[PDB]
């Protein structure tokens, strides 16, 4: 269906290329699975020689880590704020790797810092994903603190 | 070719199997095992060609199913079992024991040994690291794992396997001035005294005081000293005289 071969592309000089064999099963691809937000759902895959893969169609209640106090706690996922490569994913609410989100601060026990205090009055905090959702099958990430919060907030919608 | 190969051809067979390149077309492709592809031979050729105990395929099953064949102290009934380097095979009947290493002309030989040598076995360490729950381990060439050994045994030193309790008993370290045995390369079956150890090769001395250089992976030290001699040597002792002296013994030496 979808191949990853290299025999079809042009040469370094720009001349055309010619094929001599059919499509092999060794280089075999799949379509994109866009992980949405909703009620949870996980389907299984079969890879080469056993080795089962997990893909997540609709994800909820991802895990996150507090960097200062060094504890890990679960939270809900509300909205997406920024996506690096394509800016259309923010209106469709798809979660991929390295895309910042907005999480509930209910179970989280935060320390007293100047920056997080004003958002902690409301329910929301910020986090950034660090795991492949479509292949591992679950999201994990870090909570934004310090100058890392200064970098992303210049890129927000405003 | 979408998968593995299962048929082997007699012309690409190794010449060290001493087969005839006559009327046959196919040869036995042996099983996967602990030894490499070069140092292994099938078992069904040993009972037919080198040892002479059977004539055809029927008499092979008779000796094997009677459970007298004992390789490394274990009974085996499969004809495709690979016999490697250095292992001791024996028959339970008649108390016959053999050690397997190469001759002088790159061929397999079988040398009758004693029951005091029939117990143990020699191998060479290749790798060592500490496994789970803080337990040390030492890995040999054939793939056996061994734990809780002496800390004076290094990565390249040889061991002595008891073969019945499967415990490391004795070891010989790696240094200069040791007797050595080689098993691969263009020079096989040479027995030599170490003179200089380089980082990748070893500069050695034959019993006929010659010289040859050989990589470190292809050798196995059998004794630290000449007086040690942990195993029994072959009859030629691996001297492998040159073609000049083979031309000298036929017609006499050139008088000058």
């Amino acid at each position: 269906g979808i191949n990853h071969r290299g025999e079809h592309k042009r040469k370094k000089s720009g001349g055309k290329s010619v094929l001599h064999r059919k499509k092999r099963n060794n280089r075999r691809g799949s379509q994109m699975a866009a992980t949405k937000v909703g009620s949870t759902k996980v389907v299984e895959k079969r890879a080469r020689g056993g080795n089962k893969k997990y893909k997540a169609l609709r994800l909820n209640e991802g895990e996150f880590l507090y960097k200062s106090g060094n504890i890990i706690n679960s939270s809900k996922i509300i909205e997406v704020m920024y996506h690096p490569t394509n800016n259309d994913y923010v209106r469709t609410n798809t979660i991929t790797k390295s895309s910042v989100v907005k999480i509930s601060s209910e179970g989280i026990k935060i320390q007293d810092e100047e920056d997080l205090k004003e958002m902690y009055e409301k329910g929301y905090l910020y986090a950034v994903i660090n795991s492949r959702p479509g292949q591992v099958g679950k999201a994990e990430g870090e909570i934004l603190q310090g100058s890392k919060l200064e970098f992303y907030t210049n890129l927000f919608k405003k | 070719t979408g998968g593995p190969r299962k048929h082997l051809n007699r012309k690409v067979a190794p010449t060290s199997w001493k087969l005839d390149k006559s009327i046959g077309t196919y040869a036995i492709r042996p099983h996967s095992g602990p030894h490499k592809k070069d140092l292994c031979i099938p078992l069904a050729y040993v009972l037919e060609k080198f040892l002479e105990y059977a004539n055809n395929r029927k008499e092979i099953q008779i000796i094997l199913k009677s459970k007298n064949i004992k390789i490394n102290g274990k009974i085996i009934e499969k004809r495709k079992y690979p016999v490697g380097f250095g292992d001791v095979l024996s028959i339970i009947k008649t108390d016959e024991h053999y050690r397997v290493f190469y001759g002088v002309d790159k061929n397999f030989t079988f040398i009758k040994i004693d029951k005091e040598e029939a117990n143990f076995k020699l191998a060479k360490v290749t790798n060592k690291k500490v496994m789970y729950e803080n337990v040390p381990y030492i890995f040999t060439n054939d793939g056996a794992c061994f734990k809780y050994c002496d800390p004076a045994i290094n990565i390249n030193d040889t061991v002595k396997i008891d073969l019945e309790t499967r415990l490391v008993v004795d070891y010989v370290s790696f240094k200069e001035g040791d007797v050595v045995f080689v098993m691969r390369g263009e020079d096989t079956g040479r027995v030599g005294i170490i003179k200089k150890i380089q980082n990748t090769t070893v500069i050695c001395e034959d019993l006929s005081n010659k010289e040859f250089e050989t990589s470190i992976d292809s050798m196995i030290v059998i004794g630290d000293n000449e007086e040690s001699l942990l195993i029994s040597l072959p009859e030629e002792k691996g001297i492998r005289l040159t073609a000049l002296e083979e031309s000298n013994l036929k017609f006499g030496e050139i008088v000058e």
Binding site: - | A243, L244, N248, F251, G252, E253, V255
Partner: protein, 171 residues
């Protein structure tokens, strides 16, 4: 073609010379050969060692005087075209290859079992030997041979007799 089906000898370069057919016909009638073809086989291997005798005189290797040249002198000596020499001495090895260039075709053609019967008292003519061998009346020490062009080696020379149980003898 294939190795089992290639040919060994070709036709000569000039097909009709009056100065070549007269020389060769003296050899056919004297030694008793049936074909011009079978004469051509015994001369090519006579050419091949002379192709190798020239190289060993010009070799600069120190071991080539010891090994291959001594491995040249023996093979003629076992068949017995050469008589005998001491292989330990160096200077006679030089004399052995120098004696090789003085041979002819007749030095090879004389050590054949057809001619070697007639040169002994067993046969009257050389044509008496070709008619005698093919019926199976002549035997070497153990073996009964039916090929008149069999080369006779040096040590097996004196042991040619009649077949003891044939009709050529009394039994």
């Amino acid at each position: 073609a294939n190795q089992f089906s290639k040919r060994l000898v070709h036709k000569p370069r000039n097909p009709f010379e009056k100065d070549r057919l007269i020389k060769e016909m003296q050899i056919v009638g004297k030694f008793g050969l049936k074909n011009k073809h079978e004469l051509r086989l015994v001369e090519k291997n006579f050419s091949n060692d002379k192709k190798e005798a020239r190289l060993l005189l010009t070799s600069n290797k120190v071991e080539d005087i010891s090994i291959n040249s001594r491995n040249l002198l023996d093979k003629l000596c076992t068949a017995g075209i050469l008589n005998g020499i001491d292989l330990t001495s160096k200077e006679e090895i030089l004399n052995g290859l120098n004696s090789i260039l003085d041979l002819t075709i007749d030095s090879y053609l004389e050590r054949t079992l057809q001619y070697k019967v007639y040169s002994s008292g067993l046969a009257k003519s050389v044509h008496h030997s070709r008619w005698l061998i093919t019926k199976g009346q002549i035997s070497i020490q153990g073996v009964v041979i039916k090929r008149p062009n069999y080369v006779v080696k040096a040590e097996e020379e004196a042991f040619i007799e009649l077949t003891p149980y044939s009709w050529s003898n009394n039994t």
